[PDB]
Write a protein that binds this ligand. Structure first.
Ligand SMILES: O=P(O)(O)C(O)(Cc1cccnc1)P(=O)(O)O
Ligand SMILES: O=P(O)(O)C(O)(Cc1cccnc1)P(=O)(O)O
Ligand SMILES: C=C(C)CCOP(=O)(O)OP(=O)(O)O
Ligand SMILES: C=C(C)CCOP(=O)(O)OP(=O)(O)O
Ligand SMILES: [Mg+2]
Ligand SMILES: [Mg+2]
Ligand SMILES: [Mg+2]
Ligand SMILES: [Mg+2]
Ligand SMILES: [Mg+2]
Ligand SMILES: [Mg+2]
Lengths: 338, 338
């Protein structure tokens, strides 16, 4: 059922590429756009895009789910996937990453390099091309434009906080606090990965009320915090065959949930070990940090946190889901918790 | 009068920064946004922003130029300056440039580096923040949003053509044609630098007709082609004390107007000299190309072209300006021709 939902969503990508790549003077640039789309918008789990499609189906009366409305829903889900693609192509450059979704990062491909900066911006531009082509006559068109623009700004402010807290070649242990961590992840991840897909489906379903969006946001931003904590845990302890990418948080001096938890539990001797080995390229220094995390039983702390987080998000669904179907939030929680 | 217009426009920047930098959790990111704005949106000529302000004043009845409408006009002119800033910060990374507006490029500043990618995207995001804060209740709000989004897409397609025609470490003389050149510059420069500022003032003045915008575009895209040809000429023959930047077109293997003109005039012996020396970092190779350009009297070809271009644009103003005041176009031509 879930594998079928994913296959159904991916089968719409060929039409998305077709409409985006249809004077002959820009032909060569349009061929490059097609290559950028095929490399960077495919290969992920499609959690955000599928959330738009399933939430729309659960929020709109089936008699109103005609062929054109369903096409608009699939198209807006692909818009969120294009936003994800834009963020990841640029993030991989700024984080000096090597692989993404089981292949070399686009910018690391021979012949691409920093031209990937413009390619990332083309992916973002395609969102607004698709919204104009399919949604311009709809009453929610401006709501969707402003929602995507706001989500991009919030993510970029979060990325600024992430990069400021992680200066290259400078110790920043003093700034690795739970308060700083929560702000980084709320802005860099929670808004675009959890609030945006549900909010887009809500606007398409005619649910535009400030209070209903605020209540959904209460659940979704908390889900988003867990998703980034899980991402931080997997950066170091995930299987690369499963995650599809190589971790860089320790080398990049990141304010990861792991280092925040390490600092809260470390003895003065362990603090000194972290200070001397964190945020540096040397593989033996990275191994020393991982050994410290294992000595402090951080994988067990993460598993206990996942349990407590799940119970907290479920309690927030009980408080704030109404009048929306709880299934809207439960289905998204299922995608991130196991 | 013109120096006074520039000073009046720059005096509004402090309020632009104030409104964009006003929870305390993102405080550190907002301080970085202020630094990005002060470094990258100031120091230029403000030709695009001033065009919005002067064209609005010339297109709107003075009785309708109340304090709030004039504020909206200044704000939209600063939005075009933020779009310029976004494009330049990223272009300087992709072109491996050293200086911009008389100072080191933002990405070359110690401590910035490739974090400049996210900084560039923050500048673009501020456009939509300003349009929502000052223009959301106006009838032209959606027209302006779509105009800025379209101008960004066109510029990015042009940047793709520019970078595809200029592969690093590969000879691309065969693709340096007048037809390829005209397409690159129409998309990368002409739309955002000439059509966007006038079109924004037209929409704010209530001039939204397809035919009127098409007629203005006929003049403006041709002006834009000359502006990029002049930029290409100055890359090599301009005084850096005046241009504020160091040229990189020869080292970067760019489809510059100069190399297009060189190829049209070169003997087979000169073609071989260009083939062996173009698109390479070696200063002696760059000097060989410049000497070839001087041997082919390319500065004289440029001066004759500037004369013929000016007469052509003036003939297009005579054909297509009506019903707009010709002063709208003449004032912009004055900014680029001497
Ligand atoms: O996929 P990644 O690189 O682990 C990541 O989650 C990517 C990302 C990019 C933009 C916003 N949020 C997450 P990061 O935050 O760099 O750890
Ligand atoms: O200022 P520059 O770098 O000479 C330039 O004009 C900058 C630019 C950036 C984006 C679009 N158009 C021009 P380029 O095209 O790279 O020669
Ligand atoms: C915000 C985060 C954690 C970045 C990765 O998101 P995903 O794990 O959803 O990545 P893909 O499925 O799109 O590859
Ligand atoms: C599109 C071009 C030619 C890039 C530079 O524009 P300007 O010459 O207007 O640059 P600033 O005044 O903003 O520095
Ligand atoms: Mg990353
Ligand atoms: Mg990152
Ligand atoms: Mg990560
Ligand atoms: Mg450049
Ligand atoms: Mg360039
Ligand atoms: Mg140039």
């Amino acid at each position: 059922v879930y594998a079928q939902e994913k296959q159904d969503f991916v089968q719409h990508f060929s039409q998305i590429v077709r409409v985006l790549t249809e004077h002959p003077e820009i032909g060569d640039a349009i061929a490059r756009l097609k290559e950028v789309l095929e490399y960077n918008t495919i290969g992920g789990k499609y959690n955000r895009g599928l959330t738009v499609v399933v939430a729309f189906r659960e929020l709109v009366e089936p008699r109103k789910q005609d062929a054109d409305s369903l096409q608009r829903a699939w198209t807006v889900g692909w818009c969120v996937e294009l936003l994800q693609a834009f963020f990841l192509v640029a993030d991989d450059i700024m984080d000096s990453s090597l692989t993404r979704r089981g292949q070399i990062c686009w910018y690391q491909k021979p012949g691409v390099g920093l031209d990937a900066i413009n390619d990332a911006n083309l992916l973002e531009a395609c969102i607004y091309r698709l919204l104009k082509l399919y949604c311009r006559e709809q009453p929610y068109y401006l709501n969707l434009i402003e929602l995507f623009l706001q989500s991009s700004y919030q993510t970029e402010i979060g990325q600024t906080l992430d990069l400021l807290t992680a200066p290259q070649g400078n110790v920043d242990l003093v700034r690795f606090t739970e308060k700083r961590y929560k702000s980084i992840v709320k802005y860099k991840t929670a808004f675009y990965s959890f609030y945006l897909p549900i909010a887009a489906a809500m606007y398409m379903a005619g649910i535009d009320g400030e209070k209903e969006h605020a209540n959904a946001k209460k659940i979704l931003l908390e889900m988003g915090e867990f998703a980034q904590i899980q991402d931080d845990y997997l950066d170091l302890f995930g299987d690369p065959s499963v995650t599809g990418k190589i971790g860089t948080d320790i080398q990049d001096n990141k304010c990861s949930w792991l280092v925040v938890q390490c600092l809260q539990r470390a003895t003065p001797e362990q603090y000194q070990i972290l200070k001397e080995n964190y945020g540096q390229k040397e593989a033996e220094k990275v191994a020393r940090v991982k050994a410290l995390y294992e000595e402090l039983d951080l994988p067990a702390v993460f598993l206990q946190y996942e349990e407590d987080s799940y119970s907290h998000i479920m309690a927030l669904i009980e408080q704030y889901a109404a009048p929306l179907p709880p299934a809207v939030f439960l289905g998204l929680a299922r995608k991130i918790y196991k």
